[PDB]
């Protein structure tokens, strides 16, 4: 049958994975290739109904956010719940200074440039094929 | 096999693949090509998102975006073509009113600049206002200053960067100057071209001849002599057409009784009465006093139809008992009987206009020494010649004063070109000739024949009545005639130009001893400026080195008629011999490019281009040789003119005449007219403010295109018809020349001897194969 | 070296030589245009 | 009547077989060529009745489950049948702990990825030919 | 539209970057390849509405001017208004002499030649692709 009509690809999530690739080359990410392959497989799986596809994406957005959190070296949420008393005690200016020290504007600019490049290249190159190929290669290397 | 895909693949995808394979197979693709095509297509689908709307829009206009790739017919290495074309699309380029208006207004302002400058110099009319000694001194210092500055710019040594900057600046100056019209612009461009050419020649003579290896020395000397001869010819041509006279007609006295007697001559030998009827009718239609013009037909065949036609219409008819010296002898024999003070001579095909003699003979009644006056056959060379009193007879459409013509014993008969020799003889006795570029009115085989006879006639004119050692000629006329003779001799320089790149590539000589870039920085300015200045002088709409390639290939073709004077050859051995040398030179050059030292590598590349140029030029000469004998169409001039048609019903149909001939007319009628064949209709033709009604019968109707035929007309009706119809008051080129050379080589492979037929066929095959990958817009 | 002196002086200035050449072209064109107008008047009449 | 018309392939069982291959390549399962090939032939037998088809699926599903259990290293079905009373009597928390320890989440992730891969490849290439070819090649290798 | 023909190119800004490339060859630039790439992405961002396109270009003009200020060795603002008092104290003739000494008219002639070449090429060849390729080349060289 025409099951290809239900294989819509990752679409915007491509940029998502592409971002991670950069943070992999930049060393900012603790990569879990199997979880990335699981997420790609779940977002690629064909759901016959359009509403089901939309609901899957809406459910997967929090899951993708949690996976991205797990892929970085940032402190876990429980640490934030424990130290919220210390966080709130600091002044607003202190928090502004700390975050400005944290925000690496080069990575923000790289994100912007990569977003533009992805929007231009989605016309000519199948980004989903390449993203899945890179994920498979990374899993192969991390296994053998 | 269908079994393999059937077992391996699911039936839907198997069916789609089989459908694609069969679709490729039906369109003439082999099985291997078809399988490769399906492989490439599935790769394209897996990599490139061909379902995206952008790619749908790419696919829908595939034919326009990929003209040389057949979508329905795969062929191996098609992905190479796809990649090349996609790279070209990536590289090539795909408030408008304000920018366009500003730009156009800028050219228009620059174009009207000469008029404003002339007006401003008119109000300060003014050297000219100083004493003779003061004028001489001021002009002398002015000329010496200008010439010393020009010499300094001629003899100035530069490095590549300074040289390139100088060339760019001079090229830009020439480009700005060309846009502005006027004779001052022409003179400025001429001076620029002279300066650049002198710089090039100075560099070649001072820095490029190799004095170490004698073979390279000899080759360089021959090539430099050829370049010097070409430069001399170019300078002489510049001088000939430096200042066209642009002569205007001086009106005849208003009293018609003071007008002279003219005898019109129409000499014919084999032309049909259809051709000569138009000429004689239009001659009878010329505005002139009847008692002051007499028409003569000089038929060498004694055709009785001509006699009856002349007697019915009244024009004089005279035949010859003997036929020595051809047309010149015929005119000389007829001249014993004419009694007018002027003799006009017309070719059979040339139609005389009514306003001919009135516009022409004012100069005759004004200037006493004017023994000749010439009107254009269809240029700018004659206008320049008239400045130097060197306008020569072209055999027709000219008026000669009778007394000077009889002084030299009639038309010269010692040369094939009796016209030019008669002009020479008129000039040698101290008489003047004129030329008016005012309209008064084919097959390229006749063009080549007439060029051949012109060359031979100039050869014999030099042989018998040598202008250089002759008496009675001013310097400018000698320069004009010598320039014509030189231009008819340009075969040896072209042979040297063809052979020299082989003198480098085969013998490994250094005919021109200089770095390749230096070569490009002294030579390309020369041809660029020469072409630009010649384009300005001629004023042609199409103007480029490509156009110049065109006359070089149509002048290399008459190399051996002119050389013998002192179709057949282009296929003979001594020609394909040269082509084969130019061809093996290319392979040897590829060998030098890969296997020779890198230090000389660029030089080899240069010779490549040179040889390529030769390969085009030779390929041109064969091509015309077969296209000369291929033209089949006849006289058909399509011009728009509002005629009228009235039916038997009297319904007035204004129409436009598409084509016309003595047999009838084919016209375009505006609107829907139910005109039936055989219906007697009235055709109203417009001659100025007069309207003449000719009754016609409709013979053919193609929709709005209606053909009408004439019932037996009368003498006055015939004259009116000829007056209203004939005696009226009336990067791409590089590609075209490439096609011309390619078609010449293809014909050479078709018609050469077999032993070289095979080689030329193979060469054409790989040339087409190589061109098959070229990107296209 | 009297003539190598000027070449050394103007060697590094293609702009100046271009301007001088343009001036010489315009000037010589003016004198030639005057002469040719004189000859044209002498021949037309 | 006509037989060959019923050779639709293993269909769903194909995935199951590939799953076993994964556990065979990961070394966590002890593959039995005889019983597995017998099960494949039993599911591949062209039965003209649709009722026989559904009845065979109904019979094979518990048989397939028992075969999968037997191919593992867990205690045999008779032993677990005898010990079911104690197993139900055991604490829920320790049972959950044992279940979590037994379940390697890497295997579940790989199985999800292979499910998606099978669903994708079930539209281009007939997986039946390759699955049966791998089974036969494994048998040939075991013979040598 | 849906196929996003809103990739209109850099147009005039092309010459802008070309100039910088020339000035990168002349050594007068403290080049910032990342900011140039971000600026190129911002200018190349596909915006459907023409009003927002014009608004984007109009805000980009001062941003481009400030970026050119930053990429040159000419001094930052603080030095500019620190020496503005001395410039005001200097005579007009001194300012004119400093102006005449500051301009290197050879680079002005080269810039004009580049302008003519850019106009001709944009008449014949899309230069936006070449400019973008050179920008990524500079970024790749700087990164590695």
Numbering used by the authors:
A (entry chain C), D (entry chain B), E (entry chain D): 12 to 155
B (entry chain A): 1 to 94, 105 to 136, 140 to 391, 417 to 479, 485 to 609, 631 to 794, 809 to 855
C (entry chain E): 26 to 70
Paper text:
Bacterial cellulosic polymers constitute a prevalent class of biofilm matrix exopolysaccharides that are synthesized by several types of bacterial cellulose secretion (Bcs) systems, which include conserved cyclic diguanylate (c-di-GMP)-dependent cellulose synthase modules together with diverse accessory subunits. In E. coli, the biogenesis of phosphoethanolamine (pEtN)-modified cellulose relies on the BcsRQABEFG macrocomplex, encompassing inner-membrane and cytosolic subunits, and an outer membrane porin, BcsC. Here we present cryo-EM structures of the E. coli Bcs macrocomplex positioning all seven BcsRQABEFG partners and multiple c-di-GMP-binding sites.
We demonstrate that BcsA’s N-terminal domain adopts an amphipathic fold to recruit three copies of the pEtN-transferase BcsG, stabilized opposite of the previously reported hexameric BcsB crown. Indeed, using local refinement to resolve the more dynamically associated pEtN-transferase, we show here that BcsANTD adopts an amphipathic fold and recruits three copies of the BcsG pEtN-transferase whose transmembrane N-terminal domains are tightly packed between BcsATMD and the sixth BcsB protomer of the crown, whereas the C-terminal catalytic BcsG modules remain unresolved in the structures. The BcsA N-terminus folds into a W-shaped series of amphipathic α–helices whose connecting loops coordinate the BcsG protomers via conserved amino acid motifs in an otherwise weakly conserved primary structure. The first and second BcsB copies engage in contacts with the BcsA synthase, where the C-terminal TA of BcsB1 fits in a groove formed by BcsA TMα1–3 and is further encased by BcsANTD to complete the membrane export module, while BcsB2-TA engages in limited hydrophobic contacts with the loop connecting BcsA TMα3 and TMα4 at the periplasmic side of the inner membrane. Interestingly, in BcsG the amphipathic helical loops point outwards relative to the crown’s lumen, where BcsB’s stacked carbohydrate-binding domains are proposed to form the polysaccharide extrusion path. This suggests major conformational gymnastics of the catalytic C-terminal domains for pEtN extraction and transfer onto the nascent cellulosic polymer, and could potentially explain the lack of resolved BcsGCTD-corresponding regions in the averaged electron density maps. The evolution of enterobacterial BcsANTD for the recruitment of multiple BcsG copies per synthase could thus provide efficient substrate mining for extensive polymer modification during processive synthase activity, where individual BcsG protomers are likely to act independently of each other. The membrane sampling and significant conformational changes, which would be required for pEtN-transfer onto a nascent polymer processively extruded through the periplasmic BcsB crown, are possibly enabled by the 48 amino-acid long interdomain linker that could at least theoretically extend more than 10–15 nm in the periplasmic space.
